[PDB]
Amino acid sequence: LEAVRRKIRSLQEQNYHLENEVARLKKLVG
Amino acid sequence: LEAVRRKIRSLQEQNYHLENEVARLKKLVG
Numbered sequence: 001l002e003a004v005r006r007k008i009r010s011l012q013e014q015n016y017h018l019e020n021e022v023a024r025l026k027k028l029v030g
Numbered sequence: 031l032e033a034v035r036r037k038i039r040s041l042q043e044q045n046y047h048l049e050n051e052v053a054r055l056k057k058l059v060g
Contacts, residue, residue, distance in 0.1 A: 001031055001034070004031065004034045004035060004038050005034060007038050007042070008037055008041055011041035011042055011045045014045055014049075015041055015044050015045055018044075018045065018047075018049055018052055019048055021052060022048050022052045022055060025055060025059065026059070029055075029059040030059060
């Protein structure tokens, strides 16, 4: 449970990080 | 456990979804 509780917070951190950065570029890019 | 373990799968699963989506876009819109 503990290994999985840290994974999802690391992964949740980046999930949006990725949905934010991928987006930010798109608007940014064209 | 399953909240973490449906969404660990899902979140990792998105943590390459966008993670290799971003990449390509780097070398696409780039």
